[PDB]
Design a protein around this ligand. Structure first.
Ligand SMILES: CCCCCCCC(=O)SCCNC(=O)CCNC(=O)[C@H](O)C(C)(C)COP(=O)(O)OP(=O)(O)OC[C@H]1O[C@@H](n2cnc3c(N)ncnc32)[C@H](O)[C@@H]1OP(=O)(O)O
Ligand SMILES: CC(=O)NCCSC(=O)[C@@H](N)CC(C)C
Length: 433
């Protein structure tokens, strides 16, 4: 034989369950950058690129998932903590006729590139000066090594380290754990009795399932990046003081009521993304998130409060078993592949969007949020703020931009009228054009 494969196997770790599903899904279309997540922080002040690069180096040392390198092997793909070659581009676009548009185009050209996992770079950090005392920190990752909460933790840590370095202070000891402990915990869960309990619960929950209700007229795999319809809204349109749990309950209830009013289906299956972070996993950047199948049963004449109680019940009974992958449940239920458990996902991310870099305020804004197989309702909300950002992310094959926009406007209106009177049956509101 040849020793190279043996040394590859002995110097690597197996992928986690979520990483395995990500890799299996990406292998079908290796030229599709739909598995990139991306955001950018607008900083209202002066950023020194050298101090920022120093902070980025420190955080890359602190979050070892940023140094994961992947290697092919007889066992598909494996990973180790390697030495990625990275750089921080600094682009001053203040002289351009449209500095904001130039920065948007730069980051779009970045996150549109295909990402080969065995060569990298799996992440990209760059600074874009869009105005005097207005900078942009652009972050991009592949979902195989990062999710939403991980990127949020990394942005917070980078902000803190930069603020500490600017005032010449030693940054406090980082709170992060190692990605290897996360991988070991996932490997232990994969052969755990907790996993058997979760599998039994999810097999009983969606035992006799139904094909998902959807606003699209066709089912198609995700190939292009999402079509995004973004709208901002005030919290009083909801009015329910909601927390993350009840905000997600209300969003899922509204989406299920809209799907029932548009399709007539009464057993609406939605997708609910969750962190799957308990204990030490709450302080380890990387990929850990899952999507739960949330069933909402519709009865004609039912109001919003009953739907919200249904959603609260489903979450209260299902979040205990959120470690079981939805793909493993789909395979275990005996469903033919291509048949999904849910079509419309409701991704509520109650992560703080505010940061402080060297005394200057800054705000986070998403560009990519993973693949959009059908419809994804992304709800960005800083806990406490009176504002919500609502993104309709759609598969370009199943939707067109203006149709998605009309659906979003009608859904916003229907949801506002729903929250106006939670006792009125959903079959009564007249909807829009
Ligand atoms: C570059 C930037 C790009 C952006 C990246 C985007 C990438 C992605 O697409 S990843 C998707 C990101 N989204 C998310 O992370 C999902 C966020 N949202 C959510 O998780 C849900 O909508 C939400 C808010 C309902 C979860 O609510 P939350 O209250 O936090 O629940 P969670 O912590 O998951 O679980 C709590 C429940 O766990 C259950 N549980 C059982 N055992 C335990 C235990 N030992 N410890 C804790 N909880 C336990 C309990 O029943 C508990 O409920 P409760 O304590 O109230 O009885
Ligand atoms: C919603 C779905 O099943 N398809 C996309 C999965 S994309 C991914 O790995 C995560 N970042 C998002 C979920 C699992 C929290």
């Amino acid at each position: 034989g040849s020793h190279m494969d043996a040394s590859v196997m002995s110097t690597t770790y197996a992928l986690s369950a979520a990483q395995t599903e990500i890799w299996l899904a990406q292998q079908l279309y290796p030229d599709s950058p739909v598995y990139n997540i991306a955001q950018y922080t607008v900083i209202e002040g002066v950023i020194e690129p050298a101090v920022f690069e120093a902070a980025l180096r420190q955080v890359i040392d602190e979050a070892d998932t940023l140094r994961l390198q992947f290697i092919d092997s007889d066992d598909g793909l494996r990973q180790r903590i390697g030495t990625p070659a990275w750089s921080m581009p600094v682009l001053d676009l203040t002289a351009q006729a449209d500095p904001q548009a130039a920065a948007q185009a730069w980051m779009r050209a970045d996150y549109q590139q295909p990402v080969n996992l065995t060569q990298g770079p799996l992440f990209c950090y760059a600074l874009l000066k869009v105005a005097p005392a207005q900078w942009m920190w652009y972050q991009r990752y592949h979902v195989i090594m990062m999710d939403g909460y991980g990127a949020y933790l990394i942005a917070q840590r980078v902000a803190y380290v930069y603020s500490a370095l600017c005032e010449g202070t030693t940054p406090a000891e980082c709170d992060f754990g190692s990605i290897l402990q996360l991988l070991e915990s996932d490997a232990q869960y994969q052969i755990s009795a907790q996993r058997a309990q979760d599998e039994a619960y999810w097999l009983k929950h969606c035992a006799n399932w139904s094909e998902p209700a959807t606003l699209a007229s066709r089912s198609a795999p995700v190939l292009q990046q999402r079509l995004r319809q973004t709208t901002y809204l005030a919290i009083q349109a909801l009015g329910d003081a909601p927390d993350a749990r009840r905000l997600a309950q209300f969003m899922t209830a509204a989406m299920a009521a809209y799907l029932y009013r548009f399709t007539g289906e009464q057993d609406v299956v939605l997708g609910l993304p969750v962190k799957v972070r308990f204990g030490a996993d709450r302080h380890i950047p990387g990929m850990k998130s899952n999507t739960l199948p949330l069933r909402l049963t519709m009865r004609p004449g039912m109001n919003l409060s009953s739907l919200m109680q249904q959603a609260a019940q489903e979450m209260q009974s299902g979040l205990r078993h959120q470690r079981y992958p939805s793909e493993a449940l789909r395979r275990q239920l005996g469903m033919p592949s291509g048949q999904r458990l849910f079509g419309t996902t409701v991704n509520v991310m109650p992560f703080d969007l505010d940061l402080s870099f060297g005394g200057y305020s800054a705000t986070n804004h998403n560009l990519l949020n993973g693949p959009a197989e059908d419809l994804m309702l992304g709800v960005y909300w800083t806990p406490g703020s009176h504002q919500l950002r609502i993104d309709f992310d759609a598969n370009p094959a199943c939707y067109t931009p203006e149709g998605l926009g009309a659906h979003q406007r009608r859904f916003i209106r229907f949801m506002q009228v729903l929250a106006a009177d939670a006792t009125q049956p959903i079959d009564s509101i007249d909807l829009l054009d």
